[model samples]
Target: STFTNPVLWEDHPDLEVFRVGSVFYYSSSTFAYSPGAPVLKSYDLVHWTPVTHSVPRLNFGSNYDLPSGTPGAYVKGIWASTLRYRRSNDRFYWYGCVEGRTYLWTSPGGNALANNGEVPPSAWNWQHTATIDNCYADAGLLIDDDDTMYIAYGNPTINVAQLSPDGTRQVRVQQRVYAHPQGQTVAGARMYKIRGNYYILVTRPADAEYVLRSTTGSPFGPYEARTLVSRIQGPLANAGFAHQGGIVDAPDGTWHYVAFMDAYPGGRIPVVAPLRWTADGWPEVVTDSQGRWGTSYPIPVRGAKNATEGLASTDLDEFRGTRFSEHWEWNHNPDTSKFTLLGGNEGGLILRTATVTGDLFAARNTLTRRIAGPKASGIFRLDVRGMRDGDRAGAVLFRDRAAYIGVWKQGNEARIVMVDDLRLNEDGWRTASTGRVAANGPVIDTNAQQDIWLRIDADITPAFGTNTERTTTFYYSIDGGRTYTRLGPAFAMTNSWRYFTGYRFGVFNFSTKSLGGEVKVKGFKMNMIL
Candidate 1:
């Protein structure tokens, strides 16, 4: 069966895909989210599931904790990553760029990491946290047939380097290849040595992503540029904002390239297209006269007929294990002590409120996942028996501007209230305040037995004439899954530079009264509405 663009609805941006046997491994950027650089596995390119996260937590700076005194790594932590498998060393390696610095991680077990007698969320080793180089953006790898390793990376100046035999350090610096040509702005360098020629894929800001060719077999190149994909229009015109990604081959020997679009409020989403080769030995992203790339294309897997024949991205959490699901990520680095996963007592997520800071952007132990669109809803079932006075516990659609629909308790009285902090200005994200009131008294009564459900429904389609127009509505339910009552006006859930990662749905317990309070979340459900 044919597949539509954005095969996986969730944001797995700056994608790099490499096939190992029948399974394809994928990795992308995760700015400031702990369990950074999540890796995924796929049978068909259209369907993907989380395999592992290479960097569990960035321990480099205090700002990683997102404390009040520091300017957090909002847009600084791990940027775009390139995952590769080296046959010579029998290892799987990944390289990532964070603020122009490069870091590398590896899983020696390769595909075995998934089923290597370990848990579902397999672990990887951070072999080299500092790659000795500090100037590459969206870097990619190319291992020659002779096992010589080269890294091609840079923005305005495309530079190439040969790594040491172990592939952990750079030993020799090759000459810079391509420079910015006039109006063409460049970044996201993905290099491939194919058919006795070297090809480097670079994205230009002028509505196109191009490929540069090196005639010599040498890594150092006198390179030339050609259009791989340029200026998409028509029905997929909204998807015309092309970004960094790479091409891979399936077991059947067919080639395809994965590209991403800036679908903000839903984060950057991946789109794949069939790759064709010219008789002169160059790979290209197939396109037509208006320069539009494929929106729906034939499935890449040989026998796969259904677009979603393989595993789909995770959207629900039953809280079945002590370890958090691969779907969850903390706002920044988490205080592991503040967030606990108890084995029993409903066997759910237990979160102790933190007094680190009141800002949701600086909120501690807030577990989140990508909130996607054209439309979607998130349901959170939280038990408030453990809550204390002045505790705020429930579901929130978090970004630069956040809104929460949760239970606010004071002096033994519990009330279901909605709060908004959507007003952002030159200062930063504004402080939280009351939104629509969902309910009061006994619904969230801390003195009585209680299990409350909070939800957020969002319309994240690029609306009107801009890509940032979006809406999110809140809800609350007291009688299990029986019914839900709307709580607020349609809140603006748009994206801005301060919160560039897009919207994330997460659970937070922050206290204005005391710190002893906690909340147990039994379940979480996220569904695509369109």
Candidate 2:
């Protein structure tokens, strides 16, 4: 069996892959969203599924909770974290810096779910073992042969720290190990001790990956470095440079480098390439005949049964159970008491107005999932009979610059409006009230019709030629998805990396006035044109 370059075409950034026994676990950074740092499990390294989230909620500060008075941590909570499994302790450790403080969480290697079920956030016994004063930003973890733990972190000036035998507390403070020769901006450092040598894999983000090797077997490296991979746009022409990820070894001892490509508007997605160590002790990422990363390659694990499962198995969700599917994540720490899941024939996901804000960014309880790449369509049935004055409830394409097609209630009148130019304010926490409703949008009488269908069709196909901008268009249906009417003009999705996430399909209900209004989402359906 063979797999493509972008094994998973979703917004999983700053990823690190590690192997424990025959299973592989991939962890990635989820900046502001609740249940940060998702852990995915895979048998073949090509196909993956979400198992659990390392951080249940952002507990560092009140800002993480997104309260009314404090500014929310939109792009500041969990950065690049190191996930590793230690044999001596029989535990899995998650190490990362959140808000300038390094924190560690340990699990007893029992959080994995079978039968393709996603482990809930509370199911994992993730103990907050230690919080160290020294920050290890974008760090990498290395558990040596003798069971010694070390961390390599920092950009340009690389630093190393020694952890206690139990890997609970940081025993050593910041020790300057190696400085990039030319001081080029570097981050996402991954440490490894292979063949009795310490190797720190670092990346100049959206550009190149380099490996620093210290043959002296010292974590503090008297080291030499070389560029491992660079300038390779795997399969997508406009997909920015693939860099900043970790290395993993297969059961047969063949090495592979798994990194992310900056495919913004859809998010930073993961790509895999084979690796080979030279006789002189330097590692290189294998390239194709055109001297670039191969679009497809043989499966990493031999004799591994082909798995058809994905991060989210199905595109259609009826909101069956009490808890949300693993694919759904709240935009920020949610007000859990405000929402309810009414299963069976009743309305599926009921969301009350969690926050009284005009800006969508400030709106709480917005459930989101990553938009599929190339092209995809997302549609949802919304029950708008319960909407009150100044309530906005609908389906949205959410990002820094977002757009939505939903019902806007003003007094007793309910109108289906398509809003665009919804953007974050200069403060980066709240959005301005400058969203413009599409001209001549449809207006409906809420007294007669209560349920409506809203859809967003996204075209994220990588531009190989001249065109570049990706687009998302909104539509609505009075009939039950049998036919649709275009509502808004094609929204040009922003491909900037500054926001740090891709456009997501979101279901939101917020009030611009008081907070007593509510809405129920019947179902969400997605069609991915891969």
Candidate 3:
């Protein structure tokens, strides 16, 4: 079977892919999003499904909760993480730096490997083990031949740390390993031990993959470094620099490198390329005749594709379940008591006003999911009958900047409005609503009709060396989704590294005056157009 590049075309960045038996697991960075560090399982390596989260919430500080008058941890929570399975304990361990401290968490059962496929968030007992004072930036974990654990991390000045036998606390502080040369900005370390040689992979400035090899048996070494992948075109013509990911070997022993392309506005998406170990000792990425990453390649493992594949292909939520599906995540720590899930014929998601604020960024319980790339549209119906005075509830397309179309209730009247130009402050924490209403609908008597549909169509096709910008447009439908009224001008989306994540489709409801107002979201449907 042959599969295309960008195995998963979503905002799954700073990832590490490793294999356990015939099953392959993927973990990636999820900054500020609660239940951070999503863990996905795959059989064929091309298709993946979310199984669990390494951390249930950002318990590092109160800022992650989005308290009133306090700036939230917008782009500061979890960075690149390291995930490894320990055969000695038969458990999976996760390590990452949060708030300048390195924290480790391990799976619950002595043998938690069985729970990898379609397991609930509560099924795996993720226990926090150790918290080291030293921050290991973009760290990589290596379980050596003797079951010894070591981590290599940092940028410019790279260092190595030895972990305790149990892999809990750091036994040795900082051992300088390899220093990145002057002109290159290097970081994102992934440690590996292959053929008795120690290897550390790092990404250089903009987009290039470099590797450091140590012939000696020591973790810290006098090593040689070289670039493995650079100046290669990814799946998207304008998507630049396929860098910053790990490498994994299949059951048949064929090796491949999994990295992310800087396809911002849509976020850093994962791409895979087949690689081979050279006669000398280095790894090389296999490219096309013109020296570009192939858009498609043969599946790494045969007979690995199954019915459960392609979980990230489409997202359609009816809001019928008691808990949120793996596809959904809160922008910040949410007040669980403020929201409820309804069942039966009129089932939907009930989001009450959790905070009394006019700023959308300060609003809690904003559920979000990654927007599919190239082109996609998201639609959801809002039940306006439960909305109280001074309430705003609707669907949004947001990153550091946001545009939302929803219902704004004022006293006995409700109107559909599209709001744009909302942005984050310079501090990267507080949000400022410097935007104006791009489009406003006529006042509707709330006592008459009780529902309205909102839609956002996004054209994220890469600029492809041109100057075309990514844009999203808002629309609303008073009479079912059969007819949609385009509202506002096309909102331009940025592809910068400021937010470090792609734009997301979110459902939010908040109060500007007092609490007690609420709204019900009928469902969310996303249509992906290649």
Candidate 3 Cα misplacement greater than 4 A, ranges: 109-122, 309-313, 343-347, 445-449, 464-466
Candidate 3: worst-modelled 10 consecutive residues by lDDT: 112-121
Cα lDDT of all candidates, in order? 0.72, 0.80, 0.82
Please estimate how well model 3 matches the true structure, expressed as its whole-model Cα lDDT: 0.82
TM-score of candidate 3 on Cα atoms, chains taken together:
0.94
Off by over 4 Å in 2: 69-71, 111-123, 306-313, 343-347, 425-433, 445-450, 463-467
- Give the range where candidate 2 is weakest over 10 consecutive residues by summed lDDT: 111-120
Off by over 4 Å in 1: 110-133, 234-237, 288-291, 304-315, 344-346, 422-443, 447-449, 464-468, 495-498
- Per-residue alpha-carbon lDDT of model 1 for 44-154, expressed as tens digits? 887777767888777546877877722466666877667777766566677776665677776665345344222223335555444655655778888777888888887
Instruction: Kindly indicate the candidate among 1 and 2 with the higher lDDT.
Output: 2
lDDT for 23 (candidate 1): 71
lDDT for position 160 in model 2 = 86
When superposed on Cα atoms, how far off is each prediction in RMSD?
Answer: 3.6, 3.0, 2.3
Q: Write the per-residue lDDT of candidate 3 for residues 1-530, one digit (tens) a residue.
A: 79998888788989999887677889999989988888888887888788778888777788889886436888988889899888777777899998899888878533445644333345577878888788899989999889999998987667888988988778885555777667556789999999888999988856787899984667877566888887777556777788889999998999999988878768888888899999987899988777888899898889984755323447567776576667788998889889998776456988999989888888899999888877899998777788888998888997778888888888887888899988887464576663578889767665423668889999876653457778899988877678988998899987666788789999999988999988888888899865
- Predicted structure 1: lDDT: 0.72
